[PDB]
Write a protein that binds this ligand. Sequence first.
Ligand SMILES: OC[C@H]1O[C@](O)(CO)[C@@H](O)[C@@H]1O
Ligand SMILES: OC[C@H]1O[C@](O)(CO)[C@@H](O)[C@@H]1O
Ligand SMILES: OC[C@H]1O[C@](O)(CO)[C@@H](O)[C@@H]1O
Ligand SMILES: OC[C@H]1O[C@](O)(CO)[C@@H](O)[C@@H]1O
Lengths: 379, 379, 379, 379
Amino acid sequence: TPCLVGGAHAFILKISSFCGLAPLRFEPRSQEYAVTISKGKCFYSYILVTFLVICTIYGLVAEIGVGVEKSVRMSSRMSQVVSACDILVVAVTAGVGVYGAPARMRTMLSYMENIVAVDRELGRHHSAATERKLCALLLLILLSFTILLVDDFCFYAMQAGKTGRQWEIVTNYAGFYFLWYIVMVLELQFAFTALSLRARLKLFNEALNVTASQCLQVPPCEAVGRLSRMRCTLCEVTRHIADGYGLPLVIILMSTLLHLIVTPYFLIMEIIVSTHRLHFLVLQFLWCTTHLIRMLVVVEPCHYTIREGKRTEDILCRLMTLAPHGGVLSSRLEVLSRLLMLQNISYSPLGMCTLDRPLMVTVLGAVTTYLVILIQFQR
Amino acid sequence: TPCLVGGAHAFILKISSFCGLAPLRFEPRSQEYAVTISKGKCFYSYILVTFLVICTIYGLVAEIGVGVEKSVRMSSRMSQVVSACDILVVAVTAGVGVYGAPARMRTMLSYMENIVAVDRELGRHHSAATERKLCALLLLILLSFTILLVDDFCFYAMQAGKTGRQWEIVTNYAGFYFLWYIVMVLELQFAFTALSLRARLKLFNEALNVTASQCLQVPPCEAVGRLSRMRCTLCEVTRHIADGYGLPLVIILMSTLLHLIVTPYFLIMEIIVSTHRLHFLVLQFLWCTTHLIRMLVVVEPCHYTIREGKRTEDILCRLMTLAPHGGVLSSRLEVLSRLLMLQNISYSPLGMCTLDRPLMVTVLGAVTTYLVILIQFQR
Amino acid sequence: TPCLVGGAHAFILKISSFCGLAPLRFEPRSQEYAVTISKGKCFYSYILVTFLVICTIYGLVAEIGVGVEKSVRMSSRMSQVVSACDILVVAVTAGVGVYGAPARMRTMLSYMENIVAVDRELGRHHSAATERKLCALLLLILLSFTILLVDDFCFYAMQAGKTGRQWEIVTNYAGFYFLWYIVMVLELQFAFTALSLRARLKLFNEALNVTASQCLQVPPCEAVGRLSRMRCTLCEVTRHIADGYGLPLVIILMSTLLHLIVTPYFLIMEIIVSTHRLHFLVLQFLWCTTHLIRMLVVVEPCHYTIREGKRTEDILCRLMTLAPHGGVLSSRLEVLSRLLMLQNISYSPLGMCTLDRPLMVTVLGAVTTYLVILIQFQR
Amino acid sequence: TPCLVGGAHAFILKISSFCGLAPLRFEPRSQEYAVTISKGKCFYSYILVTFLVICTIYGLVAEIGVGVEKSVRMSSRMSQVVSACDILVVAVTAGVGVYGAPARMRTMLSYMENIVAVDRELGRHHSAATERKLCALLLLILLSFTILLVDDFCFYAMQAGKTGRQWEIVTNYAGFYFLWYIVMVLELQFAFTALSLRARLKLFNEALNVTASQCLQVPPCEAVGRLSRMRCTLCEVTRHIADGYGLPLVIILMSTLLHLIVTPYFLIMEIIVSTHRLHFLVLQFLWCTTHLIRMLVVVEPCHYTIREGKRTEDILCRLMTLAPHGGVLSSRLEVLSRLLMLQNISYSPLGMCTLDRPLMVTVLGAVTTYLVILIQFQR
Ligand SMILES: OC[C@H]1O[C@](O)(CO)[C@@H](O)[C@@H]1O
Ligand SMILES: OC[C@H]1O[C@](O)(CO)[C@@H](O)[C@@H]1O
Ligand SMILES: OC[C@H]1O[C@](O)(CO)[C@@H](O)[C@@H]1O
Ligand SMILES: OC[C@H]1O[C@](O)(CO)[C@@H](O)[C@@H]1O
C-alpha cells in the first residue's frame, strides 16, 4: 500500500528532502510519486542540521569575541544581545524543523492514505490542478528569499572586506543563511500542506452545496452521510497536520515576533546614528517585509481553512432550510449539524495559539511594545 | 431585473457617487431608484482619488521640506512623524474606500435582489420609513464634519498668512480635507447599510414574535420555516456586507486608533508649551470628539445587530417553551434553533476584529498606552 | 396590580429613596411593601443630585484656585489632575446613578410582576429568608463606608484647621462624601438585586434537581416544562437587570479602576516624601481596601449567577443520563438543553464587559501598569 | 464504606501527610490504603504551618532590620521589597495549601467513592499501573527541588559565614525552605490528582472507541448510556478537584508570575554589578528553570485533560457517522452529543483563569513587561 503523492507534495517534498526537512524516498512508480520513510536520509538530515548549528554557534562566538570595534555587524554592546538572539532563534527554528522531520513525515504518510481516499470521492484532477498552481508561488517566494539572503551575505562580506575580514565573516555567517533557507522551506512546506487540505475542504463544500440540493450521481440522502464521513476524515487530517507542525509553528511565530522586534530596532539605530549606508536601509526594509511575509505565510492558510469551515456551516444551514420537513433528508442534516457544532476545523499549534488573523494583531501589538521598550533602553 | 432602491440608499448613494465612493447610475424609474454599475463613473472616481492622493503627498513633502521654523503645523522634528502618519493614514483610508468601490457596489447590487425579496415578505413601508429617519442623522453628521474641516482649514490658513504662507498652506493641505470628507462619507455609508440590515432583522424578530405565537395571515408552522429561510438570506446579506467593507473597516479602525493617539498628544504639547492659541485647543478637543464619534459610527450598528440576534435567540426560546409538545410547531423551531446555534449575525472585518463594544475598550487602552509612550518620548 | 415587594428590596429601597436612587412610593399595604413610581420624588432626587454635583464642582474649582501651598489635599501640581479625576469620576458615577433612577425603577417594577410569579411556584418564604439575610451585610458595609467617610472628612478638616481653612475645606468637600454615599448605595442596590435573582435561580436549580429525578407534587414531565418556562422568565429578568444597571455598572468599573490607580499613587508619594502622617497611611490603606471591596461587590453576584447557570447545566446533564430512553421525559429535557445552549445567564453591562472574576484580573493588570506609569512620570 | 486508595494517592498522600497537606489516617487494610479524615493530624498540620509562617516572618523582619550592608541576600534598598515579596508569596502559598487541607481532603474523600465506581467499570489494574508510573516522576521532581533548596541554603550559609552571620542566616531562613517544600508538595499533589483523573478519562475514551463501534461484553446501545453516566461522574469529579484546589491554584499561578519576574531581575543585577559569584548565577538559572517547571506542573495536566475531552468529541463524531441511521444506537449518541456540547472538562481555578497552555503565554508576557519595568526602575 504505497503512499502515492504528486503535484505540490512532489516538488517541495524533494526540496525539503534536499535541505533535510523530508527524509523520504521518491520511487518514480506511476505518474505520481510513491514516498516512504528513508532511514539513512534521516541520518543525513540530522548530520546536516547538527553541522549547521555547530558552525553557526561557533561563528557567533567568534563574532562576539572579535570585538565591538572589529565586528561589522555587532558595532555595539547592546547590538550583541539582539544579534545573538536573532541568530539563536533561527538556529532553534531550523533544529526544530529538522529534529522532528522523521516524525512529521511519518504522520504525513499516515494521513496520506486517508486524504487519497477523500480525494477519490471528489476527483484527483482538481486537487492536482490546485496543487500545481501553488508551485509558482513556491518558486517565487523561494527565489525572493534566496536572492535576499545572497544580497545580505554579499553586502556584509564586502563591508568586512574593507577591514580585511571578508573570509572571517564568511566563515562566521556561512551556516546562518543555510539555517534561514531551512526555516523558509519548512514554512513553505507547512503552508502548502495546509493549502492542499483547504483545497480538499473546498471541494467538499462544493459537493455538499451541489449534491444535497438536487451532477449528482447519488441520492442526496446517502450523499449527506458520505460527506459527513468525509468531513470526519478531513478533521482527522487537519488534527494530524496541526499536531505534526505545532512545535515548528509556535517556534516560527516566536521567531517572527523577535525578528519584527529586532529589525526595526536596527533600522531606527541606523537612521539615528549613521544615515550613511543606503544598502543597509534597503536590506532592513526588505527584511521587515520578509518577516511580515513569513507571518502571512504561516497564518493565511489556517484562516482560509476556518473561512471554509464557516462556509460549510452556511451551506448546511441553507440545506436544512431547503430540506423537506420530517423526511429522510432531515435527520442526515441533523447529524452533520451536530458534527459541525462539536468540531471546528482550525489549527491550534501545541494548544497555545489559534493561528488566525486575530493572532496577527496581538503579535503586532507586542512587537510595537517591545520595540519602543528597546528604543527607550537604548537612550 | 433592475435593483430598485430608495430611502437611505438613495441620498447617501448619490453623495458617495459625487465623492467617488459609489459609481452607480441613478435612473429615476419608478418611485425608488434603479442603480447599476456605471463604468465611466468608476474611472472618474479612480482619477479623483489618485489626484487627491498625489496632491496630498506632494503637499506633505513640501511641508516637510519647508522647514520646522517656517511650517505652522509641523513646529517640531517629532511633530513631523506624527503629522505625516496622520496625513498618510487618511490618504490610505480614502484610497481603500475608493480603490474598491466598484467591487463593493457589485456586492451591494448582488445582495439588493435578496434583501428586496426579504423586505417584500415584511413590508417595504417600514423599511422606507426607517431608512428615511437615518437621513437626518446623515445630514447632521456630514454638516458637523464639514464645518469642522472648514474651520480647521481656515484657522491654519490665517495662521500661515501671518508669515506669508497662506496660499502655500492652502496648496499643501487642499486635498487632505477632501480625503477627510471621503473617509467620513465612507464611514457613514457603511453605518447606514448596517443600520438598514439591522432594521430588516428587527422586522424579522417582530414577525417571529407575533406570528409564531398566535396579524398572522399564515399558519405558524409554515411561518417558522419562512422565517428560517428569511434569516438565512439575512445572514448571507450580513456576510456580503462584512466582506465588502472589511478592509475599509479595519483601515478605519486603525486610523481611529492612530488619531486618538495623535490628537491628545498635540493637545498636551500645546497646553505644556504655549497655552496661547485657544482656537487650537478648541480644534483639538473637537477633533478628539470627532474621532470618538467616528469610532462609535463604526462600531454601534454592528453591536445593535448582535443585540438583535440575541433578541432572536430570546424570542425563539420563549416560542419553544410555549410550543405544543411533540407537535408540528416543535420540529420547525428545532431547525431554527440549530440555525441560531450554527450561525451568529456579526461583523468581522477581514476576520481580525469583531466590531463590537468590547473592541472599543481594547482600542482605548491601546490609545492610552501609546499616548503615554509618546509623552515619555517627548520628555 | 400592585408590585408587592419585601425583605431586601424593602430596606435598601427606602435607603436609596432617601439618597435619591429609588423614587418609589412605599404604601404599607399588606405585610410586604407596594412600590410604584413616585413622580415628585424623582424631581427631589434630580434636585438633590444636581445640587450635590454643582457644590462638588465649585468646591473642586475653589480648591484648585486656592493654591498648591495653601491646599492640604492638593500639595503638588501633579497631585491636582489625579485628585480632580478622583472627584469627577465619583461625581459622574453619582450622576449616572441618579440621572436614570426613574428608568431603572420602571424596569424593576416591570420585572417585579414576573419574578413574583416565579417565586409563587417556588415558595416566597425561602426568598424572604434569603433576602432578609442580606440586610446584615448591607448594614455592615454601609456602616463601614460611612465611618470611613466621616473619618476621612474629619482628618482633612483637622489638617486644614492648622492653617485656618477648616470651614473652607468643609465647604469644598461637603458634597464629595455625599456623592460617595450615593455611589456606595447604588453599588449595594445592584448587588442585592443580583443576589435576589441568584437566590431565585438557586431555588430553580434545587427544584429541577429534586423534581425531575423522582416532594414532587407534580409529574416530572410537566415539571420540566414548567421549569423551562421559569428559566425563560428568569433570563428575561436577568436581561432587564443588566440593561437597567449597565451604564452604572461600567461607570462603577472605570471608577474602581481609576481609584485603584490613584490611591496607591498617593500612598507611595507619602511613603517616599513624608512618612509623617500615620493617619494618612491608614486612610490610604483603608481606601484601597474599600475600592477592592467595591470591585468585589460589583463582580461577585454575577459570578455566582454564572456558577448557578453552570450548575443548571450539570443537573440537566445528570437528568438526561438518568432519564428513560425514548420516553416523554426525554424530549422535555431536549427542549431544556436547547434553551441552555442558546441562553446563558450572565451580566454584560452595555455589552462591553462581562462582569465576572476574569474581569478582575484584567482590571488589576491595568491598575498595575497605569500605577507604574504614574510612578515613572512623577520621577 | 471506607475510601480505598492506592498507587499515586498512597505515596504522595503520605508525603503530604508528613508535610501537613493531607491529614488522613492510613489504615493498612487490604492491598490498597483506607484513608479517612484524621482530626488531630489536622491540628498538627495547622500548628506546623503556623510555626513555619511565624518563624519565616520573624526571620524576614530580622533580615530587613539587620541592615543593607550586613545582609548578604538584601544588599540593596530596592532588593528588599522584591525579596520580601518573594518570601511572603511562598508564605501565603504554603498557608493556603495547609489552611484548607482538611476541606480538600474531605472533597477528595467525597469523590473517591465515585471515582472507584468509575474505575470498577473500566479496570483498576490500568489505573494502578498508570498511577504507579507517576511515582518515579514524583520522586525525581521532589529530589531535584530538595537538592536545589539544600544547595541554596548552604550557599547562603557559607556566604554569611564570611561575615560571621551563618547561624543568624540559618535562623532567619530556616522556615523559608520548609515553606518551599510544602508548596512544591502541594503542586505535585494537585498535578498527580489531575493526572489520575486524566488516566480515567483516557480509559473512558478507549472504551467509547472500542465498544460503541463493535472486547465488548455488552451491546453498544447500553454501552453508550453507561459511558454517558460515567462521563457525568467524571465531570463531577473534575469539578470537585477544581473547586478544592482553585485557591491554591491561583495562588501558585501568581507566585510563579512573581518569581519569574523576580529571579531574572536578580540574575541581571548580578551580571551587571558583580559578575563575581558563579554559584549565584548557577542558582539563579536553576531557580528560573524551577519556576518554569512549576508552571508546567500546574498547567500541563489540565491541558492534557482538555485534549482528552477533544478526543472524546472526535470519537463521538466518528461513532455518529458510523452509526446506523434511525436505529437505537443513534439517539444514545444524541444524548452523549448534547452532554459534550453542554459540558467541557476543564480546570478553572476560582473562575478567574482557565489553566491551559494559552495561560502560559499571557503569564510570560506579563513577566517580560514587569521585568523590564523593574529594570527601568533600577536604572
Ligand atoms: O538586520 C536584521 C535582519 O538581519 C538578519 O539577521 C539577517 O541577516 C535578520 O534575522 C534580521 O531581520
Ligand atoms: O491636530 C490633530 C488633528 O488635526 C488633523 O490632522 C486634521 O487637521 C486630524 O487628523 C487630527 O486629529
Ligand atoms: O487618597 C485617595 C483616596 O481619597 C479619596 O479621594 C476619598 O477622600 C478616594 O477617592 C481615594 O481612594
Ligand atoms: O534569587 C531568587 C530566587 O531565590 C529564592 O528566593 C529562593 O532562595 C526564590 O524564591 C527565587 O526564585
